[PDB]
Amino acid sequence: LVFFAEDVGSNKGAIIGLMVGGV
Amino acid sequence: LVFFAEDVGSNKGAIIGLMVGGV
Amino acid sequence: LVFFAEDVGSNKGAIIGLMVGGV
Amino acid sequence: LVFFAEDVGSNKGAIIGLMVGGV
Amino acid sequence: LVFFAEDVGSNKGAIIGLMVGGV
Amino acid sequence: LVFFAEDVGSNKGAIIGLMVGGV
Amino acid sequence: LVFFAEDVGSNKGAIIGLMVGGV
Amino acid sequence: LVFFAEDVGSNKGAIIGLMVGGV
Amino acid sequence: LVFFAEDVGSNKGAIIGLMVGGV
Amino acid sequence: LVFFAEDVGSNKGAIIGLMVGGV
Amino acid sequence: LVFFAEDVGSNKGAIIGLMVGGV
Amino acid sequence: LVFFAEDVGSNKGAIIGLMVGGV
Amino acid sequence: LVFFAEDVGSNKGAIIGLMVGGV
Amino acid sequence: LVFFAEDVGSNKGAIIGLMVGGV
Amino acid sequence: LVFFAEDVGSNKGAIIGLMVGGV
Amino acid sequence: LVFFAEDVGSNKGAIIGLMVGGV
Amino acid sequence: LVFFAEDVGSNKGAIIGLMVGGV
Amino acid sequence: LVFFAEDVGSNKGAIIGLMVGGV
Amino acid sequence: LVFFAEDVGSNKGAIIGLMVGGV
Amino acid sequence: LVFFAEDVGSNKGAIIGLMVGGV
Amino acid sequence: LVFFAEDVGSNKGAIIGLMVGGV
Amino acid sequence: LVFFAEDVGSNKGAIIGLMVGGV
Amino acid sequence: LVFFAEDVGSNKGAIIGLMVGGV
Amino acid sequence: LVFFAEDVGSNKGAIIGLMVGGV
Amino acid sequence: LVFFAEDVGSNKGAIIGLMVGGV
Amino acid sequence: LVFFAEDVGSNKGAIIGLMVGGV
Amino acid sequence: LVFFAEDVGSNKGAIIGLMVGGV
Amino acid sequence: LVFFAEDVGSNKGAIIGLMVGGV
Amino acid sequence: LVFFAEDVGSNKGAIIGLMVGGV
Amino acid sequence: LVFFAEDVGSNKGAIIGLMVGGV
Amino acid sequence: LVFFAEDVGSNKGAIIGLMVGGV
Amino acid sequence: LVFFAEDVGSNKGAIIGLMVGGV
Amino acid sequence: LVFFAEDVGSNKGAIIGLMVGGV
Amino acid sequence: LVFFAEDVGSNKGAIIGLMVGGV
Amino acid sequence: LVFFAEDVGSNKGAIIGLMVGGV
Amino acid sequence: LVFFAEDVGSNKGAIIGLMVGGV
Amino acid sequence: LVFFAEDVGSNKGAIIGLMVGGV
Amino acid sequence: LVFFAEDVGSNKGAIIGLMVGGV
Amino acid sequence: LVFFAEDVGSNKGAIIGLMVGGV
């Protein structure tokens, strides 16, 4: 019996695929 | 018996595909 | 028996496809 | 028996396709 | 038996195709 | 047996195709 | 047997094609 | 057997083609 | 057998082609 | 057998072609 | 000095409010 | 000084409120 | 000083309220 | 000095509010 | 000096608000 | 001196707000 | 001197806000 | 001197906000 | 002297924000 | 009996796929 | 002299933000 | 009895796939 | 003299932010 | 009885897959 | 003279941020 | 009875897969 | 003279940030 | 003269940041 | 009775898989 | 003259940062 | 009774798998 | 003349930073 | 009674697997 | 003339930084 | 009663597995 | 003339930095 | 003429830096 | 009563498994 | 002429730096 109590696989922060930052 | 209690795979934060930031 | 209780795959935050931010 | 209780794949937040923000 | 109880694929928030914001 | 109980693919929020906001 | 109970593809909110807002 | 019970593709809200709002 | 029960493609709300609102 | 029960393509609300509202 | 030279917010193409196309 | 030179909010194309095309 | 030079909100094309085209 | 040379926010293509296409 | 030479925020293609395509 | 030569924020392709495709 | 030669932030392909595809 | 020769931040492919594909 | 010859930050492939695929 | 009390596999921080930072 | 000859930061493949695949 | 009290496999910090930093 | 001949920081394969695969 | 009190396998710091730093 | 002949920092394979695979 | 009091297998520092640093 | 002939820092295989695999 | 003939610092295999495998 | 008081197997420092440093 | 003929510093096998395997 | 008071098997310093340093 | 014929500093096997295996 | 007071098996210094240093 | 014929400093076996195995 | 007061089996210095130093 | 025929300084077996095995 | 025929300085067995084995 | 006051079996200096130093 | 036929300085057995075995 493995009752999950809170979220599973949720994104509460940030995800970026591809970041490009020239100056 | 694996009752999920809260969200699964929800986005509560942020997702970006492709970020480009020249100055 | 895997009754989902709350949302699954919902977007409660933000999604951006492609962000471009020159100055 | 996998009765979904709340929304699935709903957008409760925001989706943007392509964001462009020069100054 | 996978009875959906609430909405599926509904937009309760916002969708934008293409956002452009010069100043 | 997958009886949908509420709306499917309804827009209860907002959709914009193309937003342009100069100042 | 997939009896739809409520609306499908209805617009209960707002749709805009192209929004332009200079000041 | 997919008996639609309520409206399909009805507009109960608002549709705008092209909105222009200078000040 | 897909008997439509209520309206299909009816406008119960509002449609605008082109809105222009200077001040 | 797709017997339509109520109206199809009827306007029960409002349609405007082109709205112009200066002040 | 932001002199607009050509049209602003003109429709040179097509706008449809609600399109329904059964066969 | 924002002198508009040509038309603003003119319809040079086509606007349709509600199109229904069974065959 | 925002002198409009040409037409504003004129219809030079076509407007249709409700188009129905069975065959 | 940001003189716009051609159109801004013009529709040279197509806009549809809500498209429904059963067969 | 940021003279825009061609169109800004014009729709030369297509925009759809909400597409529904059962068969 | 950042003279834009061609279009900025134009849609030459396609934008869809919400696509629903049951069979 | 950063003269942009071609398009910036144009959509030459496709954007979808929310895609739902049951069978 | 950083003259951009071709497109910057253009979408020549595809962007999807939220994809849901039950069977 | 860092002349960019081809595209920068263009999407020639595919971007998905959030993919959900139950069976 | 292995009841999970808090989140499992949630992102509370940051994820980047591919970071590129020339100067 | 660091002339970039081909693309920089382009997506020629695929990006996914958050993938969820129950069965 | 191995009750997990706090998070398991959560990212509270940072993850980068591939970092490239020329100067 | 460090002329880059082919792509730099391009994604020709695949990027996933967060993958969740229960069965 | 091996009750875990705090996190297990959490990332509170940093993870990099592949770091490349020419000058 | 350190002419790079092929790609630098390109992803020709796969990147995953966070993988979670219960059964 | 081997109650773990603090973290087990957590990364509070740094992990790098493959570091390459030419000059 | 240190001409690089093939790729440098490319990912032709696989990178995972954080893998969690309970059963 | 130290001409590199094949790849340098490429990942042709696999990299994992943090692996956690309870049963 | 072997109660662990602080961390076990935590990384509070640094781990590198493969370091390559030509000059 | 120290011409490298094959790969240098490539990963053709496997790298793991931190492995944790309770049962 | 062998109560461990501080860390066991923690890395507070540095670990390198394979170091290669040509000049 | 010290021509290297095969790989130098390549990982064809396995590298682990920190292995922890309680039972 | 053999209470360990400080760390056991901790790395406060440095570990290298395989060091290779040609010149 | 000291031509190396096969690999130098390659890992064809296994490297572990720090192994901890309580029971 | 053999209370250990300070570290046991800690590495405060350096460990190398295999050192190879041609010139 | 001291041609090395096979590997030099390769690890075909196993290397461990620090092994700790309580029971 | 001192041609080495097989391996030199290879590890075909095992190396341990520091072994600690309490019971 | 054999209370150990300082470290036991600690490495405060250096350990090398296998050293190979051709010239 | 002192042709070495088999291995020189290879470890086919075992090497331990520092062994500590209390009970």
Contact Q20 E11 (CB under 8 A): no
Distance (Å, whole) CA AG20 – CA AC20: 10
Stated length of chain C: 23
AM20 touches chain AI (CB under 8 A): yes
Distance (Å, whole) CA A3 – CA B3: 5
3-state secondary structure of A2: coil
Is the dihedral angle over the CA atoms W6, W10, W14, W15 positive or is it negative?
positive
Residue E17 distance to chain Q (closest CA, Å): 6
Q: Which residue has the tokens 């309804």?
A: F10
All residues at 6 or more sequence positions from J21 whose CB lies less than 8 Å from its CB, including other chains: I19, I20, I21
Distance (Å, whole) CA P11 – CA L8: 20
Instruction: Classify residue AH23 as exposed, middle or buried by CB count within 10 Å of its CB (0-12, 13-18, 19+).
Output: exposed
> Which residues is AJ4 bridged to in the sheet?
AH4, AK4
Distance (Å, whole) CA AG20 – CA AH16: 17
Query: Which residues in chain I belong to E strands, given as ranges?
Result: 14-20
3-state secondary structure of B2: coil
Q: Which two tokens stand for residue I15?
A: 């449609």
> Which residues is Z20 bridged to in the sheet?
X20, AC20
Distance (Å, whole) CA G10 – CA C9: 22
**Residue I19: its chain K contacts at CB < 8 A?**
none
- Are AD20 and AF22 in contact by the 8 Å Cβ rule? The answer is no
Distance (Å, whole) CA AK18 – CA AD3: 38
Q: Which two tokens stand for residue AF11?
A: 């990982």
Q: Which two tokens stand for residue L16?
A: 């349709």
Q: Which residue has the tokens 């990942």?
A: AB11
CA distances from E22 to R19, AH3, AJ15, AM6 (A): 30, 62, 59, 74
AB8 touches chain X (CB under 8 A): no
- Are AD18 and Z15 in contact by the 8 Å Cβ rule? The answer is yes
Distance (Å, whole) CA E19 – CA F13: 18
Q: Which two tokens stand for residue H5?
A: 């019970």
What was the resolution (in A) of this experimentally determined structure?
3.6
D14 touches chain Q (CB under 8 A): no
3-state secondary structure of D13: coil
Nearest CA among AD20, D11, O16, X11 for reference residue S17: D11
**Residue B15: its chain S contacts at CB < 8 A?**
17-18
Nearest CA among N4, D22, Q7 for reference residue O5: N4
W17 touches chain B (CB under 8 A): yes
Residue H16 distance to chain I (closest CA, Å): 5
- Output phi, psi for W19, to 5 deg: -110, 130
All residues at 6 or more sequence positions from AI22 whose CB lies less than 8 Å from its CB, including other chains: AG22, AG23, AL21, AL22, AL23
Using CA coordinates, name the residue in chain AC closest to Z4: AC4
Nearest CA among AG15, AB22, AM15, AG18 for reference residue AE10: AG15
Distance (Å, whole) CA J10 – CA J17: 17
Query: Which residues in AG1-23 belong to E strands, given as ranges?
Result: 14-20
> Which residues is G4 bridged to in the sheet?
F4, H4
All residues at 6 or more sequence positions from C11 whose CB lies less than 8 Å from its CB, including other chains: B10, B11, D10, D11, D12, D13, D14, D15, E13, R17, R18, S17, S18
- Are F17 and P15 in contact by the 8 Å Cβ rule? The answer is yes
**Residue AK8: its chain AM contacts at CB < 8 A?**
7-10
How remote is the C-alpha of AE14 from its chain's centroid? Answer: 6
Neighbour count for residue AI10 (Cβ, 10 Å)? 28
- Are A10 and C10 in contact by the 8 Å Cβ rule? The answer is no
Q: How many CA atoms lie within 13 A of O22 on its CB side?
A: 14
Nearest CA among N5, M6, H20, N7 for reference residue L5: M6
- Are J16 and I17 in contact by the 8 Å Cβ rule? The answer is yes
Q: Which two tokens stand for residue E2?
A: 């996978």
All residues at 6 or more sequence positions from P8 whose CB lies less than 8 Å from its CB, including other chains: D20, E20, O4, O6, O8, O9, Q7, Q8, Q9, Q10
- Are Y12 and W13 in contact by the 8 Å Cβ rule? The answer is yes
Q: Which two tokens stand for residue A20?
A: 């490009």
Residue V1 distance to chain AA (closest CA, Å): 16
Question: Which residue type occupies AM21?
Answer: G
Contact E3 D8 (CB under 8 A): no
Q: Which two tokens stand for residue Q14?
A: 């496709």
- Output phi, psi for I3, to 5 deg: -70, 115
Q: Which two tokens stand for residue S9?
A: 């930050």
Y17 touches chain V (CB under 8 A): yes
AC2: left (phi over 0), alpha (psi -120 to 50) or beta: beta
Q: Which two tokens stand for residue AH19?
A: 């192994």
- Output phi, psi for D10, to 5 deg: -80, 150
DSSP, res AD9: S
Question: Which residue type occupies AB21?
Answer: G
Distance (Å, whole) CA Q7 – CA S10: 11
First to last CA, chain AJ: 54
DSSP, res K12: S
CA distances from L2 to H23, I20, L5, N8, S15 (A): 12, 17, 9, 14, 39
Distance (Å, whole) CA AF23 – CA AG22: 43
DSSP line for S1-23: ---B-S-BS-BSSEEEEEEE---
CA distances from E6 to A2, D7, E10, F3, F13 (A): 26, 5, 10, 11, 16
Q: Which two tokens stand for residue E21?
A: 């914001």
DSSP, res B15: E
Stated length of chain H: 23
Nearest CA among AE9, Z9, AF20 for reference residue X9: Z9
Q: How many CA atoms lie within 13 A of I20 on its CB side?
A: 22
- Are V14 and X14 in contact by the 8 Å Cβ rule? The answer is yes
Rounded to a whole number of angstroms, the CA Rg of chain E reads: 16
- Are J14 and I14 in contact by the 8 Å Cβ rule? The answer is yes
All residues at 6 or more sequence positions from A2 whose CB lies less than 8 Å from its CB, including other chains: B2, T2, T3, T4
Biggest CA-to-CA distance, chain X: 54
User: What angle (nearest 5°) sits at the alpha carbon of residue E8, between those of residues J2 and Q16?
Assistant: 95
Distance (Å, whole) CA X20 – CA Y2: 16
Q: Nearest CB to V17: which of T7, T18, T22?
A: T18
- Are AG17 and AI20 in contact by the 8 Å Cβ rule? The answer is no
Stated length of chain Z: 23
All residues at 6 or more sequence positions from AB21 whose CB lies less than 8 Å from its CB, including other chains: AA20, AA21, AA22, AD19, AD20, AD21
Nearest CA among P17, F3, R21 for reference residue Q21: R21
Four-point Cα dihedral I16, I18, I19, I20, nearest 10? -170
All residues at 6 or more sequence positions from K6 whose CB lies less than 8 Å from its CB, including other chains: L5, L6, N4, N5, N6, N7, N8, N10
- Are N10 and L13 in contact by the 8 Å Cβ rule? The answer is no
Q: Which two tokens stand for residue M21?
A: 């085209």
- Are G18 and N9 in contact by the 8 Å Cβ rule? The answer is yes
Please tell me which chains touch H, using 3 or more CB pairs under 8 Å as the contact test. G, I, K, L, N, O
Nearest CA among T10, AE7, V9 for reference residue X7: V9
Distance (Å, whole) CA K10 – CA L11: 6
Distance (Å, whole) CA X20 – CA AA10: 10
V20 touches chain Y (CB under 8 A): yes
Distance (Å, whole) CA W7 – CA U5: 8
**Residue U8: its chain S contacts at CB < 8 A?**
4, 6, 8-9
CA distances from U18 to B10, F9, S16 (A): 9, 21, 8
Distance (Å, whole) CA X17 – CA AA13: 12
DSSP line for chain AI: ---B-S-BS-BSSEEEEEEE---
Q: Which two tokens stand for residue S12?
A: 């020639």
Using CA coordinates, name the residue in chain A closest to S14: A17
DSSP, res C17: E
Distance (Å, whole) CA F12 – CA D12: 10
- Are AE3 and AC5 in contact by the 8 Å Cβ rule? The answer is yes
Residue X4 distance to chain V (closest CA, Å): 5
Nearest CA among W19, C3, V4 for reference residue B4: C3
Neighbour count for residue F1 (Cβ, 10 Å)? 8
Distance (Å, whole) CA A9 – CA T15: 13
DSSP line for AM1-23: ---B-S-BS-BSSEEEEEEE---
CA distances from M6 to L2, L9, U5, AF11 (A): 14, 11, 47, 73
Q: Which two tokens stand for residue S15?
A: 């971007």
Q: Which two tokens stand for residue N20?
A: 């429904």
Q: Which residue has the tokens 């072994």?
A: AK19
Q: Which two tokens stand for residue J12?
A: 């029960």
Size of interface Z-AC (CB pairs under 8 A): 73
Distance (Å, whole) CA AL5 – CA AL13: 19
| T and W interact (at least 3 Cβ pairs within 8 A) | yes
3-state secondary structure of J4: strand
Distance (Å, whole) CA D7 – CA E6: 5
P17: left (phi over 0), alpha (psi -120 to 50) or beta: alpha
